[PDB]
Design a protein around this ligand. Structure first.
Ligand SMILES: NC(=O)c1ccc[n+]([C@@H]2O[C@H](COP(=O)([O-])OP(=O)(O)OC[C@H]3O[C@@H](n4cnc5c(N)ncnc54)[C@H](OP(=O)(O)O)[C@@H]3O)[C@@H](O)[C@H]2O)c1
Ligand SMILES: [Cl-]
Length: 219
């Protein structure tokens, strides 16, 4: 990896948990997991791993967040749903002068989906969720962070489908879906990128190739 110490914020999330297992199996990274009630949620083989540290708390707990990112070289933000939560995280990172962040957001906010997929997508999301995501993004942009935003299309689970393509900012986003396992691979690959340039304060889409559909199929 390009980093040794990573803090995963929102560590019980589906992508976060899969990322955790992948980083334990395939790297020598030291991982700090943060989120609500982790000790009674995260599997025992993860909690008891020598390279795992577990801290319980919410994105609105300044002291605990700061503890969680104290020794981080990179921070993964597992949800970007709330401006207020994003602000709390940015403030904690600022207090410890942590700079490198990878965050996951929803694709489509900027009109990048083609018309039918865009229509289906917004028919299937509350306005409040969408505008929350847009606000979280704005907060991250205002920060001093060397961030990468991953704009994810519709998610599903399939260990056999780990192919992904990155979609540059402003490009038409034609992929209607992507597996969580493929997103984990994309995160793994960015964490191993010798050249961070294309990921430096950029917003990149992640989609499954060949899923040019009018709606996600989730399989
Ligand atoms: N569903 C889709 O198709 C889709 C597509 C694109 C993007 N996304 C979004 O991309 C993100 C990652 O996907 P995912 O499948 O891994 O979602 P996920 O399972 O819901 O994981 C998100 C995690 O963030 C945690 N979290 C959010 N706010 C928090 C707070 N204030 N304090 C502590 N923890 C907090 C949640 O904790 P708790 O479990 O304790 O509530 C949850 O475990 C999510 O934000 C998701 O909504 C979803
Ligand atoms: Cl704790």
């Amino acid at each position: 990896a390009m980093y040794k110490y990573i803090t995963i914020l929102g560590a019980a999330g589906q992508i976060a948990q899969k990322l955790t297992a992948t980083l334990l199996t395939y790297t020598d990274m030291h991982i700090t997991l943060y989120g609500r009630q982790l000790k009674t949620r995260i599997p025992p083989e993860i909690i008891d791993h020598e390279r795992v540290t577990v801290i319980e708390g919410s994105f609105q707990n300044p002291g605990k967040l700061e503890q969680a990112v104290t020794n981080a070289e990179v921070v993964f933000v597992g949800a970007m749903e709330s401006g207020s939560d994003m602000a709390s995280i940015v403030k904690a990172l600022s207090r410890k002068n942590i700079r490198r962040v990878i965050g996951v957001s929803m694709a489509g906010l900027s009109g990048e989906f083609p018309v039918a997929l865009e229509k289906w997508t917004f028919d299937n999301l509350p306005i409040s969720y969408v505008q929350g995501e847009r606000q979280a993004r704005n907060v991250l942009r205002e920060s001093n962070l060397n961030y990468t935003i991953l704009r994810l299309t519709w998610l599903y689970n399939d260990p056999e489908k780990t192919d992904y393509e990155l979609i540059p900012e402003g490009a038409q986003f034609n992929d209607a879906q992507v597996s969580r396992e493929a997103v984990v691979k994309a995160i793994f690959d960015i964490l191993h990128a010798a050249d961070e340039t294309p990921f430096h304060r950029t917003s990149i889409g992640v989609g499954e190739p060949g899923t040019h559909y009018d709606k996600p199929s989730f399989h």
